[PDB]
Amino acid sequence: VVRPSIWVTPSERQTILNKIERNEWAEKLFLSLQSRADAATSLTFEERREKLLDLPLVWQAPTLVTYTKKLRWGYPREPQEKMLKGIQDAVDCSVLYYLTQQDKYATCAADILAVFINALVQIPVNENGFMNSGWMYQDDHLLEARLVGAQLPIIYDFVYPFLKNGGQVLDVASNQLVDFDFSAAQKVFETYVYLALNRGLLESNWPVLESSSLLHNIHAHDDPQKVAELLPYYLDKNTQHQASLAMIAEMFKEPGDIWPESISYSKHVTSLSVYLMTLIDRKYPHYKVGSLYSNIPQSLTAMYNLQFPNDGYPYFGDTNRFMDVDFQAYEMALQLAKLNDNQEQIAQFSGVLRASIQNGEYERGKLPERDYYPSPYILPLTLLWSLDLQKPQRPRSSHLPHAGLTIQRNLSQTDPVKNSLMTWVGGGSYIHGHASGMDMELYGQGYVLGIDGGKGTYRTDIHENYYRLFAAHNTVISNGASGSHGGWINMGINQVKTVAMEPAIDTQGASPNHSFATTEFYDEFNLVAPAQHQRTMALIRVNDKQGYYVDIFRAKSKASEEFHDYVYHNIGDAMDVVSNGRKVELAAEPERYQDSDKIKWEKHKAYQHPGWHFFKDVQSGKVSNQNFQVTFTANELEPHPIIMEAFIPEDSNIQFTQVSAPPSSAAAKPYNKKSLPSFLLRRQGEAWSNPFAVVYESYTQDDRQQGVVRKVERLMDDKVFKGLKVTLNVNGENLHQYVLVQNQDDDVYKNLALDIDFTGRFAVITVDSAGELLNAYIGKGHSLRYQDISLKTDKNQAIFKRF
Ligand SMILES: [Ca+2]
Numbered sequence: 077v078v079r080p081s082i083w084v085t086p087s088e089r090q091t092i093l094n095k096i097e098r099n100e101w102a103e104k105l106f107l108s109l110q111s112r113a114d115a116a117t118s119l120t121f122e123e124r125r126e127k128l129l130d131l132p133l134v135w136q137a138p139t140l141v142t143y144t145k146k147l148r149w150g151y152p153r154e155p156q157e158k159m160l161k162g163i164q165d166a167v168d169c170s171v172l173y174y175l176t177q178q179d180k181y182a183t184c185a186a187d188i189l190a191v192f193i194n195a196l197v198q199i200p201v202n203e204n205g206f207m208n209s210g211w212m213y214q215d216d217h218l219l220e221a222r223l224v225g226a227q228l229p230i231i232y233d234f235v236y237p238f239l240k241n242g243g244q245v246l247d248v249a250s251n252q253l254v255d256f257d258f259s260a261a262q263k264v265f266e267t268y269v270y271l272a273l274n275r276g277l278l279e280s281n282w283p284v285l286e287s288s289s290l291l292h293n294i295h296a297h298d299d300p301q302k303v304a305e306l307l308p309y310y311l312d313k314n315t316q317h318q319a320s321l322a323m324i325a326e327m328f329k330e331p332g333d334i335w336p337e338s339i340s341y342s343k344h345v346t347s348l349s350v351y352l353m354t355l356i357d358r359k360y361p362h363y364k365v366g367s368l369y370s371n372i373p374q375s376l377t378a379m380y381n382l383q384f385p386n387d388g389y390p391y392f393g394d395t396n397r398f399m400d401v402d403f404q405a406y407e408m409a410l411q412l413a414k415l416n417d418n419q420e421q422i423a424q425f426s427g428v429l430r431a432s433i434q435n436g437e438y439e440r441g442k443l444p445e446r447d448y449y450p451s452p453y454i455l456p457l458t459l460l461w462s463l464d465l466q467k468p469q470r471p472r473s474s475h476l477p478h479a480g481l482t483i484q485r486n487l488s489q490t491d492p493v494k495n496s497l498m499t500w501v502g503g504g505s506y507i508h509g510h511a512s513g514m515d516m517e518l519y520g521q522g523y524v525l526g527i528d529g530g531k532g533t534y535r536t537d538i539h540e541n542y543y544r545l546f547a548a549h550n551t552v553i554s555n556g557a558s559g560s561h562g563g564w565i566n567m568g569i570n571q572v573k574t575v576a577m578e579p580a581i582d583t584q585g586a587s588p589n590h591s592f593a594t595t596e597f598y599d600e601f602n603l604v605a606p607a608q609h610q611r612t613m614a615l616i617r618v619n620d621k622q623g624y625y626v627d628i629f630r631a632k633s634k635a636s637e638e639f640h641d642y643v644y645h646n647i648g649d650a651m652d653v654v655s656n657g658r659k660v661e662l663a664a665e666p667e668r669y670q671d672s673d674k675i676k677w678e679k680h681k682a683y684q685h686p687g688w689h690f691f692k693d694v695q696s697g698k699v700s701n702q703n704f705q706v707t708f709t710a711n712e713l714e715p716h717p718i719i720m721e722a723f724i725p726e727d728s729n730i731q732f733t734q735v736s737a738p739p740s741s742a743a744a745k746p747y748n749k750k751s752l753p754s755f756l757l758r759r760q761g762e763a764w765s766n767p768f769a770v771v772y773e774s775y776t777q778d779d780r781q782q783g784v785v786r787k788v789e790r791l792m793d794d795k796v797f798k799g800l801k802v803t804l805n806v807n808g809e810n811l812h813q814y815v816l817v818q819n820q821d822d823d824v825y826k827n828l829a830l831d832i833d834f835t836g837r838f839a840v841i842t843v844d845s846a847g848e849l850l851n852a853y854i855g856k857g858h859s860l861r862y863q864d865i866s867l868k869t870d871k872n873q874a875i876f877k878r879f
């Protein structure tokens with residue numbers, strides 16, 4: 077084997093040198109990396125030994141500190157940071173040696189490597205049979221593979237030319253120059269390969285986390301026949317303790333799929349897989365894993381298309397709202413796409429990179445500081461690999477199957493951050509998922525306002541018995557008892573399924589100002605009686621600055637008695653409620669939700685569904701057929717207050733309750749530490765023929781118009797709900813939108829007073845104050861008649877007409 081071979085080859089060196097000559101960003105990375113290498117080099121022979129005595133030596137060669145069971149990852153912080161400083165110094169110097177061929181760098185790097193190799197071969201491998209037993213980390217191979225195993229073979233691959241041609245290392249014990257122990261290094265590389273294949277979980281992200289150690293140590297074997305004999309155990313052969321790439325790709329079956337957890341956990345699997353795939357296709361041009369498994373790099377775009385207009389992510393499960401763009405993953409996915417002749421990916425990835433350089437989000441010449449995070453050290457590849465390069469729009473609807481998730485977005489032409497509309501609805505069974513039911517979030521005014529209830533500290537009472545349960549989510553609880561079962565630690569719920577939607581995925585709508593999606597969810601694991609749930613949400617844009625959401629939620633239990641609760645949470649520090657325009661009299665009801673506290677919590681096993689005993693400041697009205705208007709006010713996000721209005725129509729036959737929910741981590745700072753204003757609408761009996769209905773609209777209190785929605789009323793056909801009448805006021809003028817909503821694709825609606833006929837599921841009619849038809853939208857339907865006008869639907873059962 078000619079070396080280096082793993083990250084780079086000798087024949088690539090001038091190409092890299094030329095990129096530094098011709099590109100400012102590359103020279104700046106080179107100079108920063110060189111400044112780190114230089115700090116580790118030594119001027120004198122005594123300083124050479126000093127650097128090795130900085131390592132966590134145990135005193136013929138010394139060993140290193142071993143880790144069993146001021147603390148980091150659960151082990152003494154102090155030796156680990158000495159170790160990691162050493163290892164990463166050595167990688168940086170070994171890259172500077174490749175680039176400059178100055179021996180001062182090779183000697184620094186190989187001295188450190190020699191200390192690791194000579195120490196490890198004296199330490200017994202842990203044969204207590206525990207599946208995550210390691211070597212230096214007697215009880216954590218997973219950690220060791222990320223911190224140590226992946227890095228030693230790289231150093232070796234860069235310093236090999238120096239050592240094979242008579243270079244020597246400083247034997248720290250004797251203070252003598254001595255030959256590198258190549259036989260001992262082979263045994264280290266053999267042992268980390270064995271460990272990756274015979275330690276760890278097989279069905280998990282663990283094999284991916286272990287794959288840099290596996291693939292690097294395979295290629296540091298001195299026999300090319302053995303290298304090729306071992307390579308299949310990354311590419312496509314599994315063991316009891318290791319998934320191959322081919323098996324990992326089964327979790328990216330369809331374009332648009334991602335590693336099936338929450339976004340924050342899912343992102344790491346894409347980062348690492350893209351690195352490993354690029355390594356393979358750089359070195360072995362015939363495998364073309366970037367084509368065979370192009371859904372893996374595609375997960376970058378899949379995640380991009382989930383984002384809100386303010387770059388935040390849907391907060392489903394144990395996740396975060398904001399996560400830095402993974403520019404290193406884009407740099408390598410762009411190289412992978414070039415190697416594999418994938419033009420759509422070339423365009424997208426270079427489009428994200430170019431846009432982020434243009435707007436100053438990505439400083440391509442800035443070398444990140446070492447975080448000493450537990451992941452393979454690949455910082456130098458910024459320079460060594462990234463291509464000389466000489467924003468993509470998100471679709472109106474997106475779907476993510478594993479999370480049962482559907483996005484509707486309607487972007488403004490002007491101030492998109494403030495004025496765009498976006499919702500997602502979802503729910504399903506996956507690791508780091510919640511018993512969310514069929515839940516949702518609502519965007520407005522630069523922020524996610526209708527928010528998921530957040531996450532707690534793992535394994536705590538409030539995390540398992542509130543944050544992960546239904547009452548923490550914008551959904552319906554049925555029979556006071558909606559819950560979960562099986563799957564991941566009894567968190568399992570059924571998938572949310574799409575019934576209909578328009579525009580369909582990755583298409584343009586019939587109408588630029590209208591969309592809807594109807595989804596359904598079986599609340600099978602209810603402690604009292606299963607319930608069927610169905611939800612219709614629509615995004616109605618009135619103009620480039622104003623728009624609103626319609627939320628219709630049906631629930632029906634398989635039982636002769638039932639009740640249902642509709643739950644909404646919204647960021648704020650103030651919440652006000654009126655009914656028929658007047659202040660509501662709410663009575664304190666501190667015990668309302670306390671019966672679920674009688675359920676016995678068994679950690680990791682049984683939970684106090686639905687979690688609402690954790691609400692505070694509980695205050696309830698009477699059963700009412702009056703309307704309600706809730707005003708949420710957030711005073712601490714922007715200089716002017718940000719308002720969400722919720723219009724609950726008359727004849728909803730609900731009891732209104734206001735609560736303060738536990739603080740939510742999905743809320744923008746400083747509200748992540750503040751109580752979360754919330755309401756519940758309780759219906760006695762079924763909630764299907766006359767379902768929950770709410771209209772949401774946001775605005776910023778400097779806004780000229782404030783909100784355009786002024787009234788919301790039910791369209792009722794003999795106790796059966798058929799939609800809503802929304803009264804708008806736009807630049808002083810009154811308009812009416814009739815939002816027609818039926819439960820069957822062939823249902824026929826006749827409203828004699830309005831002179832309307834509609835056959836279909838979802839439509840929206842817009843008329844002026846005199847009743848003139850301005851435009852009509854059929855999202856899913858056959859026929860519409862308003863007065864003397866009649867419309868028919870094209871393909872897809874949708875149409876839009878202006879008059
Ligand atoms: Ca493994």
Ligand SMILES: [Ca+2]
Pocket residue numbers: 594610611612628629630
């Ligand atoms: Ca519905």
Ligand SMILES: [Fe+3]
Pocket residue numbers: 386388397522523524743744
């Ligand atoms: Fe936000």
Ligand SMILES: [Mg+2]
Pocket residue numbers: 655660661697698700732
């Ligand atoms: Mg009341």
Ligand SMILES: [Mn+2]
Pocket residue numbers: 391392393510512528529530543544548549
């Ligand atoms: Mn949640």
